[PDB]
């Protein structure tokens, strides 16, 4: 999303957009994990330091989009939020530990070539693919540097925890990971403001399926050398995701 390429049509059919009804504006990214469940980052709905606390009726869900601002008639679908669910131990106070949230839509969305959920990892796929050096993909309509015309895409390698901890003064947890090239590694690219809540995905070489490994959570700047994007560790909060969905559903 900071360099960054235009997506391919239907390249990320699970990519959701968090849209503000008034003033009509892009809010955040999100992902479709079922016909009636969208996955996003808690901070996209609740983040007191910036006076942010959105309720269901303040937001709309837009699925199947390619253009950032256009209303893609016959292709995108806009859904209403029945209910928001933030992780109980979401730490907005200190470091966005457990930066995750679920959204039940009021009605079930219709799948299409442009609309299709991503899988959630299992312990074995996660142990399998969450490895330093393995690249994941992140997509989003956010800033192109510290505003795109279409959905942007970028593949980033996972970074060693030490390197991660050593790049920042903020306390890193087991519930996060980081991605991004080293200053060395010639290539760059990063998430930025606006991509937040968007999915970090990987394609399993085992069954050829796409799994969401991470949620775009935070960075210090965007595409700064020696800095990395930090993503919510989805497999880790899985029991919370399961629990929430097996009950309020």
């Amino acid at each position: 999303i900071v360099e960054g390429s235009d997506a391919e049509i239907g390249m990320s059919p699970w990519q959701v957009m968090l849209f503000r009804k008034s003033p009509q504006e892009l809010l955040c990214g999100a992902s479709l994990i079922s016909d009636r469940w969208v996955l996003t980052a808690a901070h996209c709905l609740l983040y007191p330091p910036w006076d942010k606390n959105f309720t269901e009726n303040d937001l709309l869900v837009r699925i199947g989009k390619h253009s950032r601002t256009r209303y893609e008639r016959n292709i995108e679908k806009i859904s209403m939020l029945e209910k928001i669910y933030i992780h109980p131990r979401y730490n907005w106070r200190e470091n966005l530990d457990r930066d995750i949230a679920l959204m039940k839509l009021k009605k079930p969305v219709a799948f299409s070539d442009y609309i299709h959920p991503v899988c959630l990892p299992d312990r074995e796929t996660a142990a399998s693919l969450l490895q330093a050096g393995y690249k994941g993909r992140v997509t989003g309509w956010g800033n192109l540097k510290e505003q795109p015309s279409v959905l942007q895409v970028v593949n980033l390698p996972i970074v060693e925890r030490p390197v991660c901890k050593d790049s920042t003064r903020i306390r890193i947890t087991d519930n996060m990971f980081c991605a991004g090239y080293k200053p060395d590694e010639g290539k760059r690219g990063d998430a930025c403001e606006g991509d937040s809540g968007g999915p970090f995905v990987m394609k399993s070489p085992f069954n050829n399926r796409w799994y969401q490994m991470g949620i775009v959570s935070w960075g210090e700047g965007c595409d700064r050398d020696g800095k990395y994007g930090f993503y919510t560790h989805v497999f880790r909060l899985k029991k919370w995701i399961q629990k929430v969905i097996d009950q309020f559903g």
Binding site: F19, Q24, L26, T69, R70, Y71, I78, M80
Partner: peptide, 9 residues
């Protein structure tokens, strides 16, 4: 800058 989503949403 966002084109008008339908009023029915």
């Amino acid at each position: 800058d966002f084109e008008e989503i339908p009023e029915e949403y």
